[PDB]
Amino acid sequence: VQLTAAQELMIQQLVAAQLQCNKRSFSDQPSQQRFAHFTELAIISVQEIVDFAKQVPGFLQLGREDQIALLKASTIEIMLLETARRYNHETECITFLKDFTYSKDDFHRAGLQVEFINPIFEFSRAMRRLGLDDAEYALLIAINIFSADRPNVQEPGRVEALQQPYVEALLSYTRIKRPQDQLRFPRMLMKLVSLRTLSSVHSEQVFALRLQDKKLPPLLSEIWDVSHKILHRLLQD
Amino acid sequence: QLTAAQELMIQQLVAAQLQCNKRSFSDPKVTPWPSASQQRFAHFTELAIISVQEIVDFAKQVPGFLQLGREDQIALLKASTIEIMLLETARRYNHETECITFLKDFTYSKDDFHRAGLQVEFINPIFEFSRAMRRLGLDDAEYALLIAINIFSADRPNVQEPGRVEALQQPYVEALLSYTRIKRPQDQLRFPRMLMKLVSLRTLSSVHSEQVFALRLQDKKLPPLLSEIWDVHKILHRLLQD
Ligand SMILES: CC(C)[C@@H]1N(C(=O)OC(C)(C)C)CC[C@@]12C(=O)Nc1ccccc12
Ligand SMILES: CC(C)[C@@H]1N(C(=O)OC(C)(C)C)CC[C@@]12C(=O)Nc1ccccc12
């Protein structure tokens, strides 16, 4: 009933890597005005997500066409995990990147649909109730990435094997943090289930804006719209 | 050790699970497996109608489901119907033949489904889930617990009493946890993977919904009872009443 040096070492690598993310600030930073803002800001985040993904052990070792498959699906779900981490209960303003803060009302002005926005905030509220630290968020992101249930995964068993170390670490970490509360760990996992619904709802939202004359940029269209020239280039570096 | 209350609950579930999948191709008869496109669709829908009713009967036997409001019961059943069905496809997947089985003994190839006009996006995940489920290697108690856990999801659409639903689920999660510990003390990661399979059921259920809409474009519209649960609840409300 205690972590290993290997497990301790991995968690530190993840949070350290995770800390390199969301570094860009609104001061330091250089309908459609609202839209362009989001897409612009997504590209920054996506690019950070790919970089984070190379750092994690056992990811670069996978073949390229499955590295695409895991990233394509999880990238939105990571974003959602990160929006939830910095969700502020008092203001009800989700933070994106270092310091960009947006109320739920701010989103309606971008023309996002109520079927899409409310679940995001319900997700952010629900996760805040769990009370996860940076280590638990970092482990949960990794677990999320190595999802072998994603569409068009060529080597599922290889991916399942990569993920299992992160589950075992998270199980042991939660047991130490709350020995009395045995079901908090399952509660955290049941949240992974909520992420998919939001992932499917997101595919409906993105589509709807294509109708409103709001087409996605080159990088974001590769992974969200129904070749991966940009995506290969980011991975190959 | 396992609780006396917990033993009863598992026992009630497995028994209820036993009443499911009693129908045989030999035992009335559903429209036969072979216009050709149209007939295969019919074959599936008649069989599914039959399956849905057993799931509904099973769900009433599950404890505390009937504690719920008729509106919530309906919400819960409609969303998990496909997910229970797919658990069952996986449960009895033959790795030797790669043929999934439906009800008592209706066996189908991957090849068959392509022939029925189903899209790859839909078909591939189903066999992958059946394969992935096998790697876990669940026993009957474990399947049944996982099913009951599935039913009581608070984050389902149109649920009115989430807390009441989630309260009914925790007992089952606790039983599954306790059961895994007793049966396999040294395998700590087995129990989380089972819970994570619920994540896979969601993607499937979403993929399945897309398939149903694509089929409507093939001039293949679902019958009344399946249309309630899968299209975008009079018969289902009436089914609960018996
Ligand atoms: C509305 C948001 C939830 C945005 N989402 C999204 O898919 O964007 C579309 C505009 C629908 C294409 C998900 C992440 C999103 C984004 O893309 N950029 C961004 C910047 C700050 C906060 C949140 C976001
Ligand atoms: C294609 C199948 C996977 C069938 N399902 C489904 O949703 O397909 C529709 C065409 C939309 C109806 C899911 C269970 C399904 C069914 O309805 N009857 C049936 C009989 C034997 C095996 C599998 C099935």
Curated annotation (Swiss-Prot), chain A:
Subcellular location: Nucleus
Position of the Glycyl lysine isopeptide (Lys-Gly) (interchain with G-Cter in SUMO2) cross-link: K177, K215
Post-translational modification: Sumoylated by SUMO2 at Lys-177 and Lys-215 during the hepatic acute phase response, leading to promote interaction with GPS2 and prevent N-Cor corepressor complex dissociation.
Tissues in which the UniProt entry reports expression: Ubiquitous.
Superkingdom of this protein's organism: Eukaryota
Effect on the protein of changing K177R: Impaired ability to act as an anti-inflammatory role during the hepatic acute phase response
Region (Transactivation AF-2): 3-226
Domain NR LBD: start-end pairs: 6-226
Main function: Nuclear receptor that exhibits a ligand-dependent transcriptional activation activity. Binds preferentially to double-stranded oligonucleotide direct repeats having the consensus half-site sequence 5'-AGGTCA-3' and 4-nt spacing (DR-4). Regulates cholesterol uptake through MYLIP-dependent ubiquitination of LDLR, VLDLR and LRP8; DLDLR and LRP8. Interplays functionally with RORA for the regulation of genes involved in liver metabolism. Induces LPCAT3-dependent phospholipid remodeling in endoplasmic reticulum (ER) membranes of hepatocytes, driving SREBF1 processing and lipogenesis.
Subunit relationships: Forms a heterodimer with RXR. Interacts with CCAR2 (via N-terminus) in a ligand-independent manner. Interacts (when sumoylated) with GPS2; interaction with GPS2 onto hepatic acute phase protein promoters prevents N-Cor corepressor complex dissociation. Interacts with ABCA12 and ABCA1; this interaction is required for ABCA1 localization to the cell surface and is necessary for its normal activity and stability.
Family that this chain belongs to: Belongs to the nuclear hormone receptor family. NR1 subfamily.
Name of the featured protein: Oxysterols receptor LXR-beta
Organism: Homo sapiens
Gene behind the chain: NR1H2
Residues of the full protein shown: 217 to 458 of 460
